[PDB]
Amino acid sequence: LQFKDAFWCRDFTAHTGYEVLLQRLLDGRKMCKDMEELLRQRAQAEERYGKELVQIARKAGGQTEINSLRASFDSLKQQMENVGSSHIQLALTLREELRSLEEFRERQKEQRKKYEAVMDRVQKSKLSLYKKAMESKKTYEQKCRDADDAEQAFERISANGHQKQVEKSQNKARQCKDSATEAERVYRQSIAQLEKVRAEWEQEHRTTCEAFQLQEFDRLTILRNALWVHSNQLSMQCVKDDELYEEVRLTLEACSIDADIDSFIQAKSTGTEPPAPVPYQNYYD
Amino acid sequence: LQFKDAFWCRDFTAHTGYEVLLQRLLDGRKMCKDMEELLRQRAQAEERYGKELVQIARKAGGQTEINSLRASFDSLKQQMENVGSSHIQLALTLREELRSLEEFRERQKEQRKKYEAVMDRVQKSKLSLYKKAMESKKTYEQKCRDADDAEQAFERISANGHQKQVEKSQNKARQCKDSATEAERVYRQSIAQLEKVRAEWEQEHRTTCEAFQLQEFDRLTILRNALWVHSNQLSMQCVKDDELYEEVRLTLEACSIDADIDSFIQAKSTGTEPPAPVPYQNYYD
């Protein structure tokens, strides 16, 4: 199905098809803004979260610990900062995707406005010339009835009437037929002018429908792609973080409880022999 | 080598080995607090981050969109709330791990204080009896020098001195030797009392060292496992989030651009034929 084949109106004076299509583009524009707002707020959350993780890592303690357990705790603080910075970078990625959608939306608005100007102009002219044609049609039909009455009035009083009275109706019927001829010419001219604009309107409408369908195809394409890219970027963030936390686990594999205890003893041992007992010392021996 | 075999002092009055071991337990207690503070702050970040994701999802728009693209956007909002709620649950998980370490830390302090009480009592008694023994040694040696002087005074005048003077110095020298003998028995007893406490101190020291080593083994074990659990819980969060974002991609695979355009046309189509042209209508037909 195409837009150009499904949004016509049997009513000559109705442009509901164009109104419905234009309303769809406005609804699509709102959808693009909502997708933009979600990216903006998500980016703000990621930056706030990422900065907080970095602050926790930089301010965390562990300075009284030594050896392999210290190296494992230091690894966690280091990888926390790496995750936090990676989320700050993710916020920049989301804001670039947001900027791309923002550019696409205004580009579509610019082109949409041009078609709106053409359609508004030709639709107003079409309804104006239709109004004039129906006014000319009414006048033409009244002038015909006026001419028929004048002719019937002439034939009536021309059977036993005075030449002066007949001459009055003779001229009145002639003037009425002249007015009917002129009203027909104006009516025919009104029909010709309306037909010229109707042909232009039909082509512009069909042209606009093809353009509006291309905009909708492009918008649905870029919005579906944006959701796919967004979901992948979030999934890629989970993979990056998992790899960074794995670095902590790898350090933990090198953490041996016995080695740390042996390391403390070797570094801080004060002596291996208890003090000798205090004996009695004879002052003369 | 063990704590009980490596933290002795050859100096009888020094307990640096016990002081060094006690300092290590205090440093280890600070390390447990630092691990507690990191978990506490990480939980706060996860709760704040999780709550923000839920609010973004609940307030996000998309109400003007229809059909499969709407279902994809609604899927993203739904999975955002599921991720946000999952992070709030993660914060509760972290606070339970934090509570477990807090309980372990205070249990160790309670037991540590008990060993400190035993060591403080026997070390002070050991230093007290040593001080008294050295005082008895000083008194005993002074009484001996007094006896030597009294004996030297007797030997001086016993060659050409008056019998009365010689007898007088003989009695003074004998009385001084008696005082030195009495002071010797006091000195010998001081040594015996100190030796009983020295043996008691040595056994208590060895007992405390074995206990302090068991505490260090327990602390290093629970802190190593806490880091392992923490890293695993964060990695499990990456997998949970990745599974939730995968649900969005599954919805996107069912998103067809042609189907959405066809669905809009079928629902909003206004007509398939353009309006007929307005002809000139002869009043006499």
Residue numbers in the entry:
A (entry chain B), B (entry chain A): 5 to 289
Quote what the paper states about this structure.
The two structures were almost identical. After superimposition, the root mean square deviation (rmsd) between all the equivalent Cα atoms was 0.275 Ǻ, which was similar to the estimated errors of the coordinates of the structures (0.23–0.24 Ǻ). The asymmetric unit of the crystal contains two molecules of PSTPIP1 that form the characteristic elongated crescent-shape of F-BAR dimers. The dimerization interface is mainly formed by α2, α4, and the shorter helix, α5.
PSTPIP1 is an adaptor protein expressed in most immune cell lineages. It presents two structural domains in its sequence, an N-terminal Fer/CIP4 homology-Bin/Amphiphysin/Rvs (F-BAR) domain and a C-terminal SH3 domain, connected by a linker region. The F-BAR domain of PSTPIP1 binds to the PEST subfamily of protein tyrosine phosphatases (PTPs): PTPN12, also known as PTP-PEST, PTPN18, and the lymphoid phosphatase (LYP), encoded by the gene PTPN22. Positively charged residues on the concave surface of F-BAR domains interact with the polar heads of the phospholipids in the cellular membrane.
